[PDB]
Amino acid sequence: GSSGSSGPAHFIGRLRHQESIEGATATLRCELSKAAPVEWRKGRESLRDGDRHSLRQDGAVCELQICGLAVADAGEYSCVCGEERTSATLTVKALPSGPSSG
């Protein structure tokens, strides 16, 4: 309770380079100094809750879920909350599209 203010939630648990599989559904997770609204970004892109884009929050905890992954999608995702933002390189793998043997 001091003069002035502090500001938005300062990313305390910045993202972490995660590696997913092609075709699968990637799921990121981060932490904020305090429950606050954020906006994920997939390489000079804007990620918002809609068709597949999932931005569920659990008290100072954001999680981006992108269905239908793709080796191309891989790059670098960032989470903007206000003044600060964290980025984490996402690595996509190639799913085994090989026909089982009998």
mmCIF file of C-alpha atoms in Angstrom:
data_model
loop_
_atom_site.group_PDB
_atom_site.id
_atom_site.type_symbol
_atom_site.label_atom_id
_atom_site.label_comp_id
_atom_site.label_asym_id
_atom_site.label_seq_id
_atom_site.Cartn_x
_atom_site.Cartn_y
_atom_site.Cartn_z
ATOM 1 C CA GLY A 1 0.000 0.000 0.000
ATOM 2 C CA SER A 2 2.571 2.561 -1.114
ATOM 3 C CA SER A 3 2.335 5.571 -3.428
ATOM 4 C CA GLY A 4 2.259 4.877 -7.155
ATOM 5 C CA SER A 5 1.872 1.338 -8.474
ATOM 6 C CA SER A 6 3.837 -1.735 -9.555
ATOM 7 C CA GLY A 7 2.268 -2.667 -12.878
ATOM 8 C CA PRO A 8 1.230 -5.859 -14.703
ATOM 9 C CA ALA A 9 2.299 -9.407 -13.845
ATOM 10 C CA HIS A 10 6.025 -9.933 -14.401
ATOM 11 C CA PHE A 11 6.675 -13.311 -16.026
ATOM 12 C CA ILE A 12 8.273 -15.317 -13.218
ATOM 13 C CA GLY A 13 8.340 -18.697 -14.935
ATOM 14 C CA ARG A 14 9.262 -17.847 -18.518
ATOM 15 C CA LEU A 15 8.395 -20.546 -21.056
ATOM 16 C CA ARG A 16 10.780 -23.405 -21.831
ATOM 17 C CA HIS A 17 11.842 -24.758 -25.224
ATOM 18 C CA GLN A 18 9.457 -27.681 -25.707
ATOM 19 C CA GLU A 19 9.564 -30.420 -28.344
ATOM 20 C CA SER A 20 6.326 -31.880 -29.707
ATOM 21 C CA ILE A 21 5.351 -34.266 -32.502
ATOM 22 C CA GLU A 22 3.932 -33.420 -35.929
ATOM 23 C CA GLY A 23 0.161 -33.769 -36.109
ATOM 24 C CA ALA A 24 -0.102 -33.956 -32.327
ATOM 25 C CA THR A 25 -1.414 -31.206 -30.050
ATOM 26 C CA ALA A 26 1.274 -29.005 -28.503
ATOM 27 C CA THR A 27 0.648 -27.643 -25.008
ATOM 28 C CA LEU A 28 2.677 -24.805 -23.495
ATOM 29 C CA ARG A 29 2.639 -23.536 -19.909
ATOM 30 C CA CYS A 30 3.928 -20.460 -18.081
ATOM 31 C CA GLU A 31 3.590 -18.479 -14.851
ATOM 32 C CA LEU A 32 2.848 -14.839 -14.038
ATOM 33 C CA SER A 33 3.543 -12.722 -10.954
ATOM 34 C CA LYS A 34 -0.246 -12.812 -10.633
ATOM 35 C CA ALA A 35 -3.321 -14.005 -12.526
ATOM 36 C CA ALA A 36 -3.373 -11.738 -15.579
ATOM 37 C CA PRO A 37 -4.534 -11.788 -19.226
ATOM 38 C CA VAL A 38 -1.944 -12.724 -21.849
ATOM 39 C CA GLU A 39 -1.652 -13.292 -25.598
ATOM 40 C CA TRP A 40 0.464 -16.046 -27.152
ATOM 41 C CA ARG A 41 2.226 -15.423 -30.464
ATOM 42 C CA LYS A 42 3.553 -17.995 -32.933
ATOM 43 C CA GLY A 43 6.321 -16.254 -34.853
ATOM 44 C CA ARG A 44 5.239 -12.738 -35.788
ATOM 45 C CA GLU A 45 1.731 -14.127 -35.306
ATOM 46 C CA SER A 46 -1.158 -13.616 -32.884
ATOM 47 C CA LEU A 47 -2.619 -16.610 -31.048
ATOM 48 C CA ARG A 48 -6.120 -16.171 -29.627
ATOM 49 C CA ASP A 49 -8.813 -18.512 -28.308
ATOM 50 C CA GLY A 50 -11.011 -19.634 -31.187
ATOM 51 C CA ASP A 51 -11.376 -22.761 -33.306
ATOM 52 C CA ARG A 52 -8.409 -24.789 -32.060
ATOM 53 C CA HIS A 53 -6.342 -22.098 -30.336
ATOM 54 C CA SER A 54 -6.704 -22.825 -26.619
ATOM 55 C CA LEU A 55 -5.590 -20.242 -24.058
ATOM 56 C CA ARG A 56 -6.900 -21.729 -20.812
ATOM 57 C CA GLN A 57 -5.726 -20.073 -17.595
ATOM 58 C CA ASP A 58 -5.443 -21.477 -14.071
ATOM 59 C CA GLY A 59 -4.630 -18.621 -11.714
ATOM 60 C CA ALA A 60 -1.370 -16.946 -12.699
ATOM 61 C CA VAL A 61 -0.876 -19.857 -15.097
ATOM 62 C CA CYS A 62 -1.399 -19.676 -18.860
ATOM 63 C CA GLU A 63 -1.425 -22.665 -21.210
ATOM 64 C CA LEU A 64 -1.506 -22.549 -25.013
ATOM 65 C CA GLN A 65 -2.895 -25.637 -26.746
ATOM 66 C CA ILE A 66 -2.458 -25.877 -30.515
ATOM 67 C CA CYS A 67 -4.090 -28.877 -32.188
ATOM 68 C CA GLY A 68 -2.917 -30.268 -35.515
ATOM 69 C CA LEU A 69 0.781 -29.569 -35.012
ATOM 70 C CA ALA A 70 3.093 -29.277 -38.017
ATOM 71 C CA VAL A 71 6.866 -29.399 -38.480
ATOM 72 C CA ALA A 72 6.338 -25.989 -40.077
ATOM 73 C CA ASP A 73 4.561 -24.544 -37.041
ATOM 74 C CA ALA A 74 7.855 -24.965 -35.188
ATOM 75 C CA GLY A 75 9.726 -21.722 -34.586
ATOM 76 C CA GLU A 76 9.324 -19.541 -31.505
ATOM 77 C CA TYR A 77 6.226 -18.845 -29.411
ATOM 78 C CA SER A 78 5.925 -15.778 -27.182
ATOM 79 C CA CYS A 79 3.495 -14.834 -24.413
ATOM 80 C CA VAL A 80 2.611 -11.150 -24.072
ATOM 81 C CA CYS A 81 0.900 -10.101 -20.842
ATOM 82 C CA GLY A 82 1.458 -6.354 -21.002
ATOM 83 C CA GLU A 83 4.885 -4.779 -20.576
ATOM 84 C CA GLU A 84 6.944 -7.975 -20.410
ATOM 85 C CA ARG A 85 6.910 -11.084 -22.600
ATOM 86 C CA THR A 86 8.646 -14.466 -22.755
ATOM 87 C CA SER A 87 9.534 -16.614 -25.765
ATOM 88 C CA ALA A 88 10.279 -20.331 -26.075
ATOM 89 C CA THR A 89 11.566 -22.131 -29.168
ATOM 90 C CA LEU A 90 9.205 -24.954 -30.133
ATOM 91 C CA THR A 91 10.625 -28.026 -31.868
ATOM 92 C CA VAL A 92 8.307 -30.235 -33.920
ATOM 93 C CA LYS A 93 9.061 -33.880 -34.702
ATOM 94 C CA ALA A 94 8.017 -36.057 -37.641
ATOM 95 C CA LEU A 95 5.275 -38.531 -36.726
ATOM 96 C CA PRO A 96 5.846 -42.162 -37.792
ATOM 97 C CA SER A 97 3.690 -42.402 -40.916
ATOM 98 C CA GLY A 98 4.824 -45.953 -41.611
ATOM 99 C CA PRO A 99 2.409 -48.834 -42.293
ATOM 100 C CA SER A 100 2.634 -51.532 -39.621
ATOM 101 C CA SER A 101 4.044 -54.900 -40.684
ATOM 102 C CA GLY A 102 2.190 -58.202 -40.509
#
